[PDB]
Nucleic acid binder design. Structure first.
Lengths: 62, 95, 109, 98, 79, 95, 109, 79, 98
DNA sequence: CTGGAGAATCCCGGTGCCGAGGCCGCTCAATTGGTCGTAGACAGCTCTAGCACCGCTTAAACGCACGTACGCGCTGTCCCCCGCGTTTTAACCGCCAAGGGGATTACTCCCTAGTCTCCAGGCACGTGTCAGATATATACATCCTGTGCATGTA
DNA sequence: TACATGCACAGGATGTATATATCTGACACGTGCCTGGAGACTAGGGAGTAATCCCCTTGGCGGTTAAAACGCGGGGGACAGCGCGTACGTGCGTTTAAGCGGTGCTAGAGCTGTCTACGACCAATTGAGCGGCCTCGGCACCGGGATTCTCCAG
């Protein structure tokens, strides 16, 4: 299928805490979603382009 | 004294289709008349509850069909639904 | 004039009384209104279920070597059929008696 | 010496005669007096239609006969053939009456 | 006087034989009589309740079949 | 969004008469609401059959009183009939 | 309405809603017509049986060192009282649990 | 990995412990899974029968409590 | 030697805990998949409300727990403390469920 | 019968939270006060069927004598199931997105109820008769101890 | 060494089943009629529909940890023989009361005709009860201690 703009934000937010500056969903979803609650429209446009590449993939993958 | 209705003549008409040679005692007839009235009140009572649960106010062949699928055991239900569907389909051609 | 009447059961092909069943649905307080397809479907189901129990009771009458159905034959018909014994699973039939059965460890061997 | 059937031989012969017949097994007048005596506690000077005491007898015999089948199964589940008050008390507790 | 004694030992044995019972302990007769008396009390109380509601002085067979149906023991044959 | 009715405020008003210092949880409240709905249907359904057997078209206090005597166990029936009789007597004389 | 209104429950002396009980008796198809004394009788019975189960549940709550009734206390109330257990003999209460009980022949001596 | 095997031996032991059972034979587990599957089939069939009658594609908690109430096992707590 | 509780000591301790407490005892996802699998035979692509599967679990656990009490009585009647399949088969037949 | 160590269950103080319950605004269902049509309370009649009492005949109940068949205690011997270390695996804790589908709303028309008339289907009743219920004899099928064949020691 | 005793009949005795000659009351049918259902009509509103709305069910992210699964010893309960006393099945005199069939009676079911208290239904008009909303307090995990049941070598 396809993946959301939030899914690519969660993936990039997770890599930041995981190996960019050193996973389980349980406690991380607070920090991740409260960051999404104030995420900037220019970052949202980048994650929307990622969601567009995922949707272009989904049109082939079904 | 005054007239009391019962299913007895219709039970006897059906009996003479299924076993033309047999008869039925009056004690067996009052059991059959009890059975017809019991199954009537069970089906109609569940059709009433189905109509009320769905906020409708008309009892219709859908209500009777679903009441027959809940009340009857597995093989009797498929046969009873088939006889009812046949009868309404025939009736609709001449009503 | 007015066309010669014919009973609603005849239009349906039934022998159970569609007009009575309609009055019983109306006068029984089951719902505010009763659709003309309901009495036909219900009359057909009462006639079907009647045909099933009478067939098995007429077989029981022939097996008991008698020409007329009696309460015994209705009890034997119902309890041998594995679905009529569910439909009538908490009904007692007057003068029906009991279906013959003995627990195997009671036998004299 | 005179003839003897062996103990339990007539018991099986009785089971077979009473499963063959449809007749009522309680004596009618004794049962009718019991029905009137029980009803006397609920209303005084109460009359009974003759059809009503027959309906109560048919119901009462059908109830006791079916309880004895369940009692027989409770006895036969233990390694026994004699029914005992414990078997009635089990049957009526599993059947949700007590 | 006592009327439950009219449910004789032979009568309770016949009911036990129709139920398929081979052998009966001597304590069953009093246990049965108690169970029958409790059954009749439960049916005849409801039947008298329908009779009083109808403002009648006789119990009628319909009051018995209504009391039995109301307890989940439907009796066919008495209308 | 659209209004859904329940007995919950009346259950709370009765609780605050019998145990004024206690309260009731939302899961206990939906059990109490279910109990009131079930007992309402059990009494009204028998009152409906009582009216029909006697050919009457009206449910009255006699039908409700008789349905209560049929449905309730013996010690509850005496009290429930006394509370019902007191309410009809107060209502009729205060009207 | 020229005079001032007073709820039928207030004339009857009840907390339960007489008006709602009357609308439910009318719209439930129980009979062709509903007499004015039936709702006040039925509302008083529902209020009484509600007071019984809540009284016993508030006792069970206090004895369990709590101030809020929860499903457990309704189960403990219903299963200890001889008549309420008979009225609710084939009903289950979600989150109610079971009444503490061990057969004596299982105990360790 | 049949989905009925998700009713684990530990879970059946906990249900039997609430039922007051001190000691359990190893054949109880398959007998109890057979009984549970028969119970669920009878309730779910009727709940789907109410669902089809409503022309809906989802089962709703009302369909379950109506199916249980029709089978004489009234459940309180879900309205 | 290390400590041991005797056989059946912890069984009584378990009986007490599970009767003291109101929790559901079957694991939720495992039960939810069984409900969906059984439903698949009656209608395909059927959805469930999150409270409908809870109502099915509450009813199911209440049924099996009430069956085990009657099963336990059928074992105590036969002079045994161990429950066995013949006890479930008796308990069902005496309640009229088989 | 028990002193003393082990391990589980408990009683209490501290700690955080999210659900009970109290408040406010607004639509909708319960009052109030008409008119009017009929369901049922009531009184009086008819006559069914329930109640009471008796005599006679006869099956069924009862009370006892008799003696195995069954229930129950006790012994002994396994074979399971329980308690618990050790390893393995999948349930479940949060957050959200996508969209499938219950919920709501405005339109509108076909179907059910009311309301006539006016016969023919279904009841109460009367009436012969034949299948079920008796009868007396006869016919297999089942039950329960001694009787010899054919087993085996002496 | 002088008869043991299984055991498959042989059969005497006892019941259940079948063929059958007559009798009778309960059945299946015939009929007069009368009332409940059908034929033909109109009106309005429930139900089916198409169009948004928005909401909640379905799917998805891993880690870790808690629940399930596994392996094992050994104990204590399931279960099969055995001995033995008594309780309950069988069968006979004897007795008692149920079932029958008359008689006679009247309470009370079941009904019709009437008069009115009572409930339906409509048009106003409020105030009770619901949804949305906030907030702070009862309950639910913690963390020690500690205590209280458990098992076994004394």
């Amino acid at each position: 299928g396809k993946m959301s703009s939030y899914a690519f934000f969660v993936q990039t937010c997770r890599e930041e805490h995981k190996k960019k500056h050193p996973v389980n969903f349980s406690e991380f979803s607070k920090k991740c979603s409260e960051r999404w609650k104030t995420m900037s429209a220019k970052e949202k446009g980048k994650f929307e382009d990622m969601a567009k590449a995922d949707k272009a993939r989904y049109e082939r993958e079904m | 004294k005054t007239r009391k209705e019962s299913y007895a003549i219709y039970v006897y008409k059906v009996l003479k289709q299924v076993h033309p040679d047999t008869g039925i005692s009056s004690k067996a007839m009052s059991i059959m008349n009890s059975f017809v009235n019991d199954v009537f009140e069970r089906i109609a009572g569940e059709a009433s509850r189905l109509a009320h649960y769905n906020k409708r106010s008309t009892i219709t062949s859908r209500e009777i069909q679903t009441a027959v699928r809940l009340l009857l055991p597995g093989e009797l239900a498929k046969h009873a639904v088939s006889e009812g569907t046949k009868a309404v389909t025939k009736y609709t051609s001449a009503k | 004039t007015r066309a010669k009447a014919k009973t609603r059961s005849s239009r349906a092909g039934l022998q159970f009384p569609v007009g009575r069943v309609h009055r019983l649905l109306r006068k029984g307080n089951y719902a505010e209104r009763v659709g003309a397809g309901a009495p036909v479907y219900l009359a057909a189901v009462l006639e079907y279920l009647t045909a099933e129990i009478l067939e098995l009771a007429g077989n029981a009458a022939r097996d008991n070597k008698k020409t007329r159905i009696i309460p015994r034959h209705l009890q034997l018909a119902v309890r041998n059929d594995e679905e009529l014994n569910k439909l009538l699973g908490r009904v007692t039939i007057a003068q029906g008696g009991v279906l013959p059965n003995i627990q195997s460890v009671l036998l004299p061997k | 010496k005179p003839h003897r059937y062996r103990p339990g031989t007539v018991a099986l012969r009785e089971i077979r005669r009473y499963q063959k017949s449809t007749e009522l097994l309680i004596r009618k007048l004794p049962f009718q007096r019991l029905v009137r005596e029980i009803a006397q506690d609920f209303k005084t000077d109460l009359r009974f239609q003759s059809s009503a005491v027959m309906a109560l007898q048919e119901a009462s015999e059908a109830y006791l006969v079916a309880l004895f089948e369940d009692t027989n199964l409770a006895a036969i589940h233990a390694k026994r053939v004699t029914i005992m008050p414990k078997d009635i008390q089990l049957a009526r507790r599993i059947r949700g009456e007590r | 006087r006592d009327n439950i004694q009219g449910i004789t030992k032979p009568a309770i044995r016949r009911l036990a034989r129709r139920g398929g019972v081979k052998r009966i302990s001597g304590l069953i007769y009093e246990e049965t009589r108690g169970v029958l008396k409790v059954f009749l009390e439960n049916v005849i109380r409801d039947a008298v309740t329908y009779t009083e509601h109808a403002k009648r002085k006789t119990v009628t067979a319909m009051d018995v079949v209504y009391a039995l149906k109301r307890q989940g023991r439907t009796l066919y044959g008495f209308g």
